[PDB]
Amino acid sequence: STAGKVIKCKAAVLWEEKKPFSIEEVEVAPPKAHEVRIKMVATGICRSDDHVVSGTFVTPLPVIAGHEAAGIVESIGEGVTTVRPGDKVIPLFTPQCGKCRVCKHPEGNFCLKNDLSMPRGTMQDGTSRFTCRGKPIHHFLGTSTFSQYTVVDEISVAKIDAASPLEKVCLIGCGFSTGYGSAVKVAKVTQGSTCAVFGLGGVGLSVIMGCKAAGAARIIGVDINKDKFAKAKEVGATECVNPQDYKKPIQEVLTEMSNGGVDFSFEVIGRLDTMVTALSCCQEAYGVSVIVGVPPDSQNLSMNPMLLLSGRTWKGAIFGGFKSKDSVPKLVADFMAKKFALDPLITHVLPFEKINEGFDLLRSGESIRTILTF
Amino acid sequence: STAGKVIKCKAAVLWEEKKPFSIEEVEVAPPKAHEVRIKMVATGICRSDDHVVSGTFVTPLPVIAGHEAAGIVESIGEGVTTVRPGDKVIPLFTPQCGKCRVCKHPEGNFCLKNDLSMPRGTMQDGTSRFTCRGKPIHHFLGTSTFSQYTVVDEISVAKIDAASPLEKVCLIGCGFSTGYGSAVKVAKVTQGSTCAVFGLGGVGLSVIMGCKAAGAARIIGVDINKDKFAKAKEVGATECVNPQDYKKPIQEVLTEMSNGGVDFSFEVIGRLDTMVTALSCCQEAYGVSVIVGVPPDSQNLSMNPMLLLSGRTWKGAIFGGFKSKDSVPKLVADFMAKKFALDPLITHVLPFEKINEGFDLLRSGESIRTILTF
Numbered sequence A, B: 001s002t003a004g005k006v007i008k009c010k011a012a013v014l015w016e017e018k019k020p021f022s023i024e025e026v027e028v029a030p031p032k033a034h035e036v037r038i039k040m041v042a043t044g045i046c047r048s049d050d051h052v053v054s055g056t057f058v059t060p061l062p063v064i065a066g067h068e069a070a071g072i073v074e075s076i077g078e079g080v081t082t083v084r085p086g087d088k089v090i091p092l093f094t095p096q097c098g099k100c101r102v103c104k105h106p107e108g109n110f111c112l113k114n115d116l117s118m119p120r121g122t123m124q125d126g127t128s129r130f131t132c133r134g135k136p137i138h139h140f141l142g143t144s145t146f147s148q149y150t151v152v153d154e155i156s157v158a159k160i161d162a163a164s165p166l167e168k169v170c171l172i173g174c175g176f177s178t179g180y181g182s183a184v185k186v187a188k189v190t191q192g193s194t195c196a197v198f199g200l201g202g203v204g205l206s207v208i209m210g211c212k213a214a215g216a217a218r219i220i221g222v223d224i225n226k227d228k229f230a231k232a233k234e235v236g237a238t239e240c241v242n243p244q245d246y247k248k249p250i251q252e253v254l255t256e257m258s259n260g261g262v263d264f265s266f267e268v269i270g271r272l273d274t275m276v277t278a279l280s281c282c283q284e285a286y287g288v289s290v291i292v293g294v295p296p297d298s299q300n301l302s303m304n305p306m307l308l309l310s311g312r313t314w315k316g317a318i319f320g321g322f323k324s325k326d327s328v329p330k331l332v333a334d335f336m337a338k339k340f341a342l343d344p345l346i347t348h349v350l351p352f353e354k355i356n357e358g359f360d361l362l363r364s365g366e367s368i369r370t371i372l373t374f
């Protein structure tokens, strides 16, 4: 038995920015009250994890990163009521405390217990469950999935279907749900509309899936890497365009292609310039533009507010606008009922030991999602 | 009869920026096909007219400004079907052609025939109906209401109730409808919500009216001129704050007052800094901020897109989001049935010949709306 004991296990520790993960032994404390210890089964490589490595997103180091995953509960602390040992679970990088004003709001999902705004890199109680070489190691977004075992707060885990294939449904922990919800819930894409999607990685492909599910008539994918276009068309893009191919700015190209601007645009990259381009290419009176990409730390964009005064709507969201603990189990149930596909997002499946090779595939432009298996 | 003849009349001509209007004789050509010549009865002084004088809003000079008005049709050109001589009318600074993709959209109102986005200062046919001292004079937003007679395109005029008091309902041509619609139609303020309104001039007071009509529980007025607070409270503000009174930035003050951010905020001034402040003070996960104020020509704001990524919605609108020709007659009918009040906005009345004194009252901070009578 491991319950109530320290577990020594393998994890991928990030000791400093812009260095490889160190795959080595850590100690994982048992769960305290209202905490859950999870044996990980699969974890995806999201560009947001790479933002920690690159310093695009600032969080305390050293850290166990990883936030897109699925696993099996090993043990629960006193007072846990929502999961039991043996349950399949997805950790929730956006928690759902159920008590804060955001959790109580019909349209809010960015629970005030999140560790994204002012990252502390701890459990809810302000402490860490991880040690490595005698040093405390930070958590990441209350998840820390690049480890054979993690400990999460109960508000940061959802129970899912016992028959779930965890090597696929781990994508419901971030990339699929983010993109799909950004289209269907945040933008509320309408039947017959024209959409533009900037960035055709895992999250942008999931935005395309959602635009197609919502009945968009035209879905224009935009990427500087034309190798991304074939899969974008497979999942619903009707056209793809590469800004590098044009003498005009791409906002002008997209305005022309859409006979005066798109209904819905999505920034799914993480660049200030494409956030402003994406806003500009939506129709000036009734267009909607959604920011999904994570912008670089502490950098402001510049824009002319006449883009908004004419009638545009500009919004952003975390995790597709989904209330995480209510939504994740339903999204898994929908996947099991064949309501959407996840295989188009998975280009590579590697053992966890090859985490650094998986990050190199993402950085080279060669992968959509690599799933790491423990 | 004057039908088919040039009319000589008085108008307020703006020859140069940052100068008084010149009240002098102009020649007003008769209406061409699908044009309407109007004998003006009353016109309001809106801060946007002052933006023409100050070069905040660039439009070609020399010009006859004025856009908030009511009058009586003197004659109609060939093919006009929607008004007749003797009808009471309100000119529409945002037209409603009924044919463009915006007019056909259920939520658009910024008709593509507008002269706001890229001002030419002409009729739809690219020519002027005004001569002064033998020189052609520009139109303004297809309205030019600072004249005893004007000529407008048929898509820029609405027929209103024959029993309308024109010295009141002129406000439905801009300030009332803009503010009220910004709350009820654009923001869609909800019952029990907390609103913050930046700027307590005629348009911000109309925003407060709309927030109260929508059932907001708290309406916080924000102005650096504390003389504006009494009227704001009379029309529904529950609290007023002066940023000058505080050591901390007012976005932090309003976040504290609202226990974590407001539900709806409105920028009703025209400053880049207050546009960003108003966005910041709405709750980060579910808040909505609406830009109403007109920004200085060609100037960009700077902002951190993490304000949107957490969940905020940022939008703007012209004319409260109202489809102008459909909505203006209905707003007049509702005014006649006492569904809203206009007198709280009217602080001063002057004859048209005292237009410069009316602008002096606006610039000193003393007036809300001055109504000029012809």
Ligand SMILES: NC(=O)c1ccc[n+]([C@@H]2O[C@H](COP(=O)([O-])OP(=O)([O-])OC[C@H]3O[C@@H](n4cnc5c(N)[nH+]cnc54)[C@H](O)[C@@H]3O)[C@@H](O)[C@H]2O)c1
Residues within 6 Å of the ligand: A046, A047, A048, A051, A174, A175, A178, A198, A199, A200, A201, A202, A203, A204, A222, A223, A224, A225, A228, A243, A268, A269, A270, A271, A274, A291, A292, A293, A294, A295, A317, A318, A319, A320, A365, A367, A368, B309
């Ligand atoms: N809001 C959220 O909750 C959330 C969730 C998940 C991911 N993210 C962010 O979303 C973004 C996309 O993540 P991902 O899909 O995993 O990344 P990814 O797989 O790296 O995809 C990014 C795509 O953008 C393309 N690209 C780069 N520059 C440009 C350009 N100038 N114009 C057009 N295309 C360009 C690039 O070729 C690639 O295909 C990242 O910033 C993530 O951090 C946000």
Ligand SMILES: NC(=O)c1ccc[n+]([C@@H]2O[C@H](COP(=O)([O-])OP(=O)([O-])OC[C@H]3O[C@@H](n4cnc5c(N)[nH+]cnc54)[C@H](O)[C@@H]3O)[C@@H](O)[C@H]2O)c1
Residues within 6 Å of the ligand: A309, B046, B047, B048, B051, B174, B175, B178, B198, B199, B200, B201, B202, B203, B204, B222, B223, B224, B225, B228, B243, B268, B269, B270, B271, B274, B291, B292, B293, B294, B295, B317, B318, B319, B320, B365, B367, B368
């Ligand atoms: N979007 C539209 O369709 C539309 C229609 C009508 C007016 N406008 C614009 O709306 C704005 C307001 O017009 P209005 O009500 O006639 O103008 P106004 O009567 O000049 O009122 C503006 C108010 O802002 C106050 N103010 C100035 N600076 C600050 C500050 N830093 N903080 C807080 N308060 C401040 C000022 O004291 C005044 O009471 C102007 O920019 C107009 O051009 C837009």
Ligand SMILES: OCc1c(F)c(F)c(F)c(F)c1F
Residues within 6 Å of the ligand: A046, A048, A049, A057, A067, A093, A116, A141, A174, A294, A318, A319, B309
């Ligand atoms: O990919 C999900 C995700 C985000 F949406 C962020 F905004 C972020 F800062 C982050 F670290 C993250 F992992």
Ligand SMILES: OCc1c(F)c(F)c(F)c(F)c1F
Residues within 6 Å of the ligand: A309, B046, B047, B048, B049, B051, B057, B067, B093, B116, B141, B174, B294, B318, B319
């Ligand atoms: O006050 C109405 C009004 C506006 F809403 C503008 F955006 C503008 F540029 C302008 F000149 C104007 F008069």
Ligand SMILES: [Zn+2]
Residues within 6 Å of the ligand: A095, A096, A097, A098, A099, A100, A101, A102, A103, A111, A112, A113
């Ligand atoms: Zn919460």
Ligand SMILES: [Zn+2]
Residues within 6 Å of the ligand: A046, A047, A048, A049, A067, A068, A174, A175
């Ligand atoms: Zn992610």
Ligand SMILES: [Zn+2]
Residues within 6 Å of the ligand: B095, B096, B097, B098, B099, B100, B101, B102, B103, B111, B112, B113
């Ligand atoms: Zn139109």
Ligand SMILES: [Zn+2]
Residues within 6 Å of the ligand: B046, B047, B048, B049, B067, B068, B174, B175
């Ligand atoms: Zn106005």
